[PDB]
Target: Non-structural protein 3
Amino acid sequence: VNSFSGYLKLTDNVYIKNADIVEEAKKVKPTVVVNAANVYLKHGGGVAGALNKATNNAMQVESDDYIATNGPLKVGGSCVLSGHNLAKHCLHVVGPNVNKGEDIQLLKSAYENFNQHEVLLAPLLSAGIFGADPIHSLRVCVDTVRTNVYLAVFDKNLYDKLVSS
Ligand SMILES: Cn1c(=O)c2nc(SCCCNC(=S)NCCN3CCOCC3)[nH]c2n(C)c1=O
Model:
């Protein structure tokens, strides 16, 4: 239904809000929610763990079946799976693990996956344990995504830092 409310408009197509992405998805019921995944779709913590828990583990079951059939994703790549109760679809996107030496240029390829969908609810990619500077990830998002993206930033201090700049 895509009834996004309370977002700050950064550009014509990028919007941002201090919010829990699971709570947003339950309110809005978007066509697409983006998961910040790893190449094996092991949804162990962070955004991925929270989305999986909200689907009662069904996201993990579907992901495991995807991996058994297709093998792991490429860094910078993605796949569409069901959004279960949270969204129509879930776009699982793999940003680079910058801390482990994966090329940060792949953050551009990661965000390019968003351009296949007219509107997305999404987190900042690579911006937790993967070690990418969230200011940098937001800039790559703005420079790369041309479709409508609604970004949810969980931590208030970080949101305030991103929107001040
Ligand atoms: C509601 N909401 C948020 O909106 C939110 N945004 C963040 S920061 C960036 C997104 C998450 N980090 C990524 S780099 N993980 C790398 C891949 N992982 C996949 C499985 O685990 C191991 C590795 N954290 C958040 N959390 C916890 C949250 O609940």
